[PDB]
Design an enzyme around this catalytic site. Structure first.
Site, PDB file in Angstrom:
ATOM      1  N   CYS A   1     -25.828 -69.993  31.139  1.00  0.00           N
ATOM      2  CA  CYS A   1     -26.749 -70.846  30.382  1.00  0.00           C
ATOM      3  C   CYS A   1     -27.714 -69.990  29.577  1.00  0.00           C
ATOM      4  CB  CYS A   1     -27.544 -71.775  31.311  1.00  0.00           C
ATOM      5  SG  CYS A   1     -28.852 -72.719  30.443  1.00  0.00           S
TER       6      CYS A   1
ATOM      7  N   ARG B   1     -32.200 -70.523  29.654  1.00  0.00           N
ATOM      8  CA  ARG B   1     -32.924 -70.412  30.911  1.00  0.00           C
ATOM      9  C   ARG B   1     -34.361 -69.932  30.770  1.00  0.00           C
ATOM     10  NH1 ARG B   1     -29.375 -66.659  34.336  1.00  0.00           N
ATOM     11  NH2 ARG B   1     -27.973 -66.383  32.538  1.00  0.00           N
TER      12      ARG B   1
ATOM     13  N   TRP C   1     -32.074 -79.747  25.744  1.00  0.00           N
ATOM     14  CA  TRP C   1     -31.921 -80.069  24.333  1.00  0.00           C
ATOM     15  C   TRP C   1     -30.874 -79.152  23.697  1.00  0.00           C
ATOM     16  CZ3 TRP C   1     -36.722 -78.384  26.274  1.00  0.00           C
ATOM     17  CH2 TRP C   1     -37.042 -77.052  25.989  1.00  0.00           C
TER      18      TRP C   1
ATOM     19  N   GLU D   1     -23.621 -76.052  19.544  1.00  0.00           N
ATOM     20  CA  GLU D   1     -22.880 -76.938  20.443  1.00  0.00           C
ATOM     21  C   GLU D   1     -22.380 -78.184  19.730  1.00  0.00           C
ATOM     22  OE1 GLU D   1     -24.531 -77.105  24.675  1.00  0.00           O
ATOM     23  OE2 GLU D   1     -26.357 -76.757  23.488  1.00  0.00           O
TER      24      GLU D   1
HETATM   25  C1  HEM Z   1     -33.304 -77.091  27.203  1.00  0.00           C
HETATM   26  C2  HEM Z   1     -32.511 -76.277  26.483  1.00  0.00           C
HETATM   27  C3  HEM Z   1     -31.104 -75.799  26.924  1.00  0.00           C
HETATM   28  C4  HEM Z   1     -30.226 -75.198  26.103  1.00  0.00           C
HETATM   29  C5  HEM Z   1     -30.430 -74.885  24.598  1.00  0.00           C
HETATM   30  C6  HEM Z   1     -29.031 -74.887  26.852  1.00  0.00           C
HETATM   31  C7  HEM Z   1     -27.913 -74.274  26.313  1.00  0.00           C
HETATM   32  C8  HEM Z   1     -26.731 -74.030  26.973  1.00  0.00           C
HETATM   33  C9  HEM Z   1     -25.475 -73.658  26.358  1.00  0.00           C
HETATM   34  C10 HEM Z   1     -25.235 -73.440  24.856  1.00  0.00           C
HETATM   35  C11 HEM Z   1     -24.562 -73.512  27.312  1.00  0.00           C
HETATM   36  C12 HEM Z   1     -23.121 -73.075  26.995  1.00  0.00           C
HETATM   37  C13 HEM Z   1     -22.132 -74.186  27.249  1.00  0.00           C
HETATM   38  C14 HEM Z   1     -21.302 -74.406  26.010  1.00  0.00           C
HETATM   39  O1  HEM Z   1     -21.773 -74.021  24.911  1.00  0.00           O
HETATM   40  O2  HEM Z   1     -20.183 -74.974  26.102  1.00  0.00           O
HETATM   41  C15 HEM Z   1     -25.190 -73.818  28.597  1.00  0.00           C
HETATM   42  C16 HEM Z   1     -24.649 -73.788  29.868  1.00  0.00           C
HETATM   43  C17 HEM Z   1     -25.265 -74.305  30.995  1.00  0.00           C
HETATM   44  N1  HEM Z   1     -26.482 -74.980  31.061  1.00  0.00           N
HETATM   45 FE1  HEM Z   1     -27.923 -74.719  29.744  1.00  0.00          FE
HETATM   46  N2  HEM Z   1     -29.204 -75.305  28.164  1.00  0.00           N
HETATM   47  C18 HEM Z   1     -30.480 -75.872  28.246  1.00  0.00           C
HETATM   48  C19 HEM Z   1     -31.025 -76.425  29.388  1.00  0.00           C
HETATM   49  C20 HEM Z   1     -30.395 -76.557  30.615  1.00  0.00           C
HETATM   50  C21 HEM Z   1     -30.882 -77.293  31.781  1.00  0.00           C
HETATM   51  C22 HEM Z   1     -32.219 -78.087  31.870  1.00  0.00           C
HETATM   52  C23 HEM Z   1     -29.953 -77.184  32.744  1.00  0.00           C
HETATM   53  C24 HEM Z   1     -29.992 -77.723  34.186  1.00  0.00           C
HETATM   54  C25 HEM Z   1     -31.155 -77.867  34.850  1.00  0.00           C
HETATM   55  C26 HEM Z   1     -28.872 -76.382  32.230  1.00  0.00           C
HETATM   56  C27 HEM Z   1     -27.751 -76.033  32.930  1.00  0.00           C
HETATM   57  C28 HEM Z   1     -26.694 -75.328  32.399  1.00  0.00           C
HETATM   58  C29 HEM Z   1     -25.595 -74.836  33.198  1.00  0.00           C
HETATM   59  C30 HEM Z   1     -25.438 -75.006  34.741  1.00  0.00           C
HETATM   60  C31 HEM Z   1     -24.760 -74.221  32.347  1.00  0.00           C
HETATM   61  C32 HEM Z   1     -23.462 -73.515  32.749  1.00  0.00           C
HETATM   62  C33 HEM Z   1     -22.275 -74.442  32.593  1.00  0.00           C
HETATM   63  C34 HEM Z   1     -21.145 -73.900  33.433  1.00  0.00           C
HETATM   64  O3  HEM Z   1     -21.361 -73.057  34.378  1.00  0.00           O
HETATM   65  O4  HEM Z   1     -20.015 -74.331  33.100  1.00  0.00           O
HETATM   66  N3  HEM Z   1     -29.163 -76.022  30.935  1.00  0.00           N
HETATM   67  N4  HEM Z   1     -26.510 -74.126  28.327  1.00  0.00           N
HETATM   68  C1  LIG Z   2     -15.562 -75.839  32.479  1.00  0.00           C
HETATM   69  C2  LIG Z   2     -16.136 -76.403  31.193  1.00  0.00           C
HETATM   70  C3  LIG Z   2     -17.513 -75.817  30.875  1.00  0.00           C
HETATM   71  O1  LIG Z   2     -18.214 -76.697  29.991  1.00  0.00           O
HETATM   72  C4  LIG Z   2     -19.579 -76.875  29.932  1.00  0.00           C
HETATM   73  C5  LIG Z   2     -20.159 -76.794  28.676  1.00  0.00           C
HETATM   74  C6  LIG Z   2     -21.521 -76.992  28.511  1.00  0.00           C
HETATM   75  C7  LIG Z   2     -22.341 -77.203  29.601  1.00  0.00           C
HETATM   76  C8  LIG Z   2     -23.783 -77.473  29.406  1.00  0.00           C
HETATM   77  C9  LIG Z   2     -24.541 -77.957  30.468  1.00  0.00           C
HETATM   78  C10 LIG Z   2     -25.874 -78.317  30.291  1.00  0.00           C
HETATM   79  C11 LIG Z   2     -26.451 -78.176  29.032  1.00  0.00           C
HETATM   80  C12 LIG Z   2     -27.782 -78.519  28.835  1.00  0.00           C
HETATM   81  C13 LIG Z   2     -28.599 -79.052  29.976  1.00  0.00           C
HETATM   82  C14 LIG Z   2     -28.329 -78.362  27.572  1.00  0.00           C
HETATM   83  C15 LIG Z   2     -27.546 -77.866  26.521  1.00  0.00           C
HETATM   84  N1  LIG Z   2     -28.077 -77.721  25.286  1.00  0.00           N
HETATM   85  N2  LIG Z   2     -26.257 -77.549  26.734  1.00  0.00           N
HETATM   86  C16 LIG Z   2     -25.695 -77.697  27.962  1.00  0.00           C
HETATM   87  C17 LIG Z   2     -24.359 -77.360  28.153  1.00  0.00           C
HETATM   88  C18 LIG Z   2     -21.763 -77.351  30.845  1.00  0.00           C
HETATM   89  C19 LIG Z   2     -20.395 -77.166  31.029  1.00  0.00           C
HETATM   90  C20 LIG Z   2     -19.897 -77.320  32.457  1.00  0.00           C
HETATM   91  N3  LIG Z   2     -19.665 -78.759  32.758  1.00  0.00           N
END
Ligand code: HEM
Ligand SMILES: CCCOc1ccc(-c2ccc3c(C)cc(N)nc3c2)cc1CN
Ligand code: HEM
Ligand SMILES: CCCOc1ccc(-c2ccc3c(C)cc(N)nc3c2)cc1CN
Ligand SMILES: C[C@H](O)[C@H](O)[C@H]1CNc2nc(N)[nH]c(=O)c2N1
Ligand SMILES: C[C@H](O)[C@H](O)[C@H]1CNc2nc(N)[nH]c(=O)c2N1
Ligand SMILES: [Zn+2]
Lengths: 407, 411
Positions: free
Chosen positions: B108, B111, B280, B285
């Site tokens: 993520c 963070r 957000w 994305e």
């Molecule tokens: C508030 C601004 C946030 C932004 C801009 C953000 C951005 C991202 C992005 C771009 C990814 C990559 C996933 C993809 O692109 O397919 C990701 C993964 C992830 N986000 Fe964040 N996120 C935010 C907040 C949060 C919050 C509040 C949580 C949970 C409390 C969270 C939990 C996660 C987790 C667990 C992943 C990993 C997904 C996985 O392991 O497959 N995010 N985030």
């Molecule tokens: C195995 C497929 C992996 O795909 C993905 C792809 C994306 C995210 C993800 C999760 C949370 C987000 C939040 C809170 C904000 C944000 N801006 N982006 C997020 C993107 C999770 C997973 C896992 N379900």
């Protein structure tokens, strides 16, 4: 233990069994992944030879044949006395092609079996090395119709007689510390451009100064050599839409020829083995112009595009980066110099992966390095799961010579 | 034993001791890296060690390690396990756990915000309707009229795996995907499977290109139930371009609130199988993946046509060129409507600052380079040149199988 890899754009699944041949370590463990870290005697030498010779003789469908066991005993006896051994030409070529074939970070490996191998193992002097390198360069360039090549200088013996090309690539531009702060030429090469001066080079102090060759043979103090300019094919960079792009006075060289790696075959160590192919467009335009420690012409391109550079969210950097890379490809194609765009080459790699899993049972791959440095998600390798593991024969990193040379 | 990572763009080196606290396995071995693999009913036999470890962490965080409050709590959780075979987190413990789960999300990039998470305790929920009401309030709170606020809603923990709470949607708000007879897709190709389940469960589909999907909610292992989020709670942004006035005519819109609902929150050995969390959007994305991925809305070629690009050879780079414009238009539409969005440059810069801060005051920050680097213009962002160490810390967010694959249907 017969691992699988999935492409998530196409649902294709391939089963990797080649990885159970792996020997060296990756740096990773059960508890930690290092997938993004840049750099992690007679009794050891013989098994390394057996292994290589076993895979050599199977590749030619003569595993367990008379020729096989005789060659094994032949190498076996030479290690006993001479403490090392020498490769037959056929093995030399096989080994060089398979070090490229196993190069897990190289996106262009679909061409791996067309490599031109120049045996330079009879070389004894820097002048000799210079002659071989000029021949490599001329053969490789081929008037713009580039051809893959490697030239292999004598194997290491005792570390005291190492052959080393001190340039990281055969052809690179110079870099000069400017008195005011910034950098003239190319900032990657500032320290090496120093060493060349430190060794006696008359730096012209231009932007695109082809660096001299610094050749080290049999372990002696290296020697400076000027590549004949008529052998350094260069492409003046212009944009097919923007007339003002020529005004920036930009060009690059056609021949990428990496010269600081070590080639390992059957346990033998070739510390001088410059190898060359042809450029992917992004290697020059994304990296060799736009990285913050490189040319940073990004700002001028976008300035000349009168883009709103006041906040990152206009994506003016991305917008310039696209144009620059369009220009690099347009220029090379216009001058009939070989170059491959990053859509072309990643699709080829996927095809090459297909072929390796089909006729070899796998293909080691380093996703972090195969994915191009722009537009990654819209290229087909992005969604491709890959398995990374270290096979032999291989290209390895080695210390820079100027930290090691008993001067 | 200590480990170091180098940023090659700035030559800044950082030392990771925190990976020593790692326990869960990465999927890699000494001889094989699985760093690019997408995905590499618990008995009291192994639950108190997991509890003790979490509680040791929690009391360290509040600087009461070894206090009587700490030892008593261990002893209390102890007896509650051998007696009930599970245990309950205090509110404090639940909030710590959810925040640190996000702090440990190595994939993520957002963070830097991890400590500002708004934790909604829904552990008293009992029914699907109850879940619908909890989720509606999450959505309203998190949206906040376009001034997005990150939140998480935590439903009851797993007990024997036969009474799970699950949100069947992968996100709270997603658009419907319809497969047509002629082979084309209407709407979002990513949602075709879930859409069909919804329709089968009785959803009346408008069969449009941007239909908000119904919530499909499961309580206590019962069959899931459909609910329509009130439309006034779904904040959407129509996509226009600041220079191209034909872009509005593509009739695109996207929703404002990314809220992921299919993951399992693990805290101290307890599994929270339903825990939607929102923050957000980073622009890419939507702009790079939600519109331009070959397996998604794929308006790439239509944008290239309206831009009158050389679409013959790929080496005209028309795909890259249209991708930038589409991401320009996404950032522009969201900022124009004062809906919180972050561009990929801003956010990678923040993560680097966050990561450096985490190394200094925590001794590590696990990070998945494959996922952290943005899916466009990767090398001109500062994470591309940043070496990273990836390891699994708990509390964590985990993947879990789709419920419809594993569910026992009541009927
Ligand atoms: C508030 C601004 C946030 C932004 C801009 C953000 C951005 C991202 C992005 C771009 C990814 C990559 C996933 C993809 O692109 O397919 C990701 C993964 C992830 N986000 Fe964040 N996120 C935010 C907040 C949060 C919050 C509040 C949580 C949970 C409390 C969270 C939990 C996660 C987790 C667990 C992943 C990993 C997904 C996985 O392991 O497959 N995010 N985030
Ligand atoms: C195995 C497929 C992996 O795909 C993905 C792809 C994306 C995210 C993800 C999760 C949370 C987000 C939040 C809170 C904000 C944000 N801006 N982006 C997020 C993107 C999770 C997973 C896992 N379900
Ligand atoms: C013919 C066209 C070729 C293309 C387009 C190509 C492309 C690439 C690219 C894009 C990289 C990634 C590194 C970066 O982008 O900074 C790479 C690495 C590499 N290339 Fe290829 N390559 C080609 C030919 C060859 C040949 C002929 C050899 C040797 C015989 C070779 C050996 C390698 C090795 C060993 C690496 C990884 C080096 C390392 O681990 O640091 N390549 N290549
Ligand atoms: C130390 C960080 C940089 O690592 C790198 C990065 C890239 C390559 C590399 C090697 C060979 C290439 C050939 C034959 C053709 C081509 N078109 N591109 C190449 C790129 C080597 C190294 C190792 N110096
Ligand atoms: C820090 C990071 O691992 C490093 O910059 C790597 C990442 N991936 C790369 N990939 C390619 N093709 N070339 C590179 O130089 C790098 N650099
Ligand atoms: C094969 C590869 O691991 C997979 O497609 C990953 C790569 N990195 C990613 N990174 C982000 N941010 N989002 C993704 O969906 C993916 N997909
Ligand atoms: Zn790994």
């Amino acid at each position: 233990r017969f691992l699988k890899v999935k492409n998530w754009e196409t649902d294709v699944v391939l089963t990797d069994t080649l990885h159970l041949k792996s020997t060296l370590e990756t740096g990773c463990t059960e508890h930690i992944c290092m997938g993004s870290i840049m750099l992690p005697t007679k009794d050891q030498l013989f098994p390394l030879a057996k292994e290589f010779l076993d895979q050599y003789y199977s590749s030619i469908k003569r595993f367990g044949s008379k020729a096989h066991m005789d060659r094994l005993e032949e190498v076996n006896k030479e290690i006993e006395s001479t403490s090392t051994y020498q490769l037959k030409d056929t093995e030399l070529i096989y080994g060089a092609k398979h070090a490229w074939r196993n190069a897990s970070r190289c996106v262009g490996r679909i061409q791996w079996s067309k490599l031109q191998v120049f045996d330079a193992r009879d070389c004894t002097t820097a002048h000799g090395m210079f002659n071989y390198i000029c021949n490599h360069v001329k053969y490789a360039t081929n008037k713009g119709n580039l051809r893959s090549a490697i030239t292999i200088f004598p194997q290491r013996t005792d570390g005291k007689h190492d052959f080393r090309v001190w340039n990281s690539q055969l052809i690179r531009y110079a870099g000069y510390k400017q008195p005011d702060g910034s950098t003239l030429g190319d900032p990657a090469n500032v320290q090496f451009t120093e060493i060349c001066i430190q060794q006696g080079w008359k730096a012209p102090r231009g932007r695109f100064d082809v660096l001299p060759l610094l050749l080290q043979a049999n372990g002696n103090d290296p020697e400076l050599f000027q590549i004949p300019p008529e052998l350094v094919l260069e492409v003046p960079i212009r944009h097919p839409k923007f007339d003002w792009f020529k005004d920036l006075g930009l060009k690059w060289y056609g021949l990428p020829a990496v010269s600081n790696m070590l080639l390992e075959i059957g346990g033998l160590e070739f510390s001088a083995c410059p190898f060359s192919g042809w450029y992917m467009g992004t290697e020059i335009g994304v990296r060799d112009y736009c990285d913050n420690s490189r040319y940073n012409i990004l700002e001028e391109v976008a300035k000349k595009m009168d883009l709103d550079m006041r906040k990152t969210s206009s994506l003016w950097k991305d917008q310039a980066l696209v144009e620059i890379n369009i220009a690099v490809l347009y220029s090379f194609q216009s001058d009939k110099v070989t170059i491959v765009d990053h859509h072309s080459a990643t699709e080829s790699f996927i095809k090459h992966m297909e072929n390796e899993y089909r006729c070899r049972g796998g293909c080691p791959a380093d996703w972090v390095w195969i994915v191009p440095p722009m537009s990654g998600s819209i290229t087909p390798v992005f969604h491709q799961e890959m398995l990374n593991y270290r096979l032999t024969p291989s290209f390895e990193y080695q210390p820079d010579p100027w930290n090691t040379h008993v001067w």
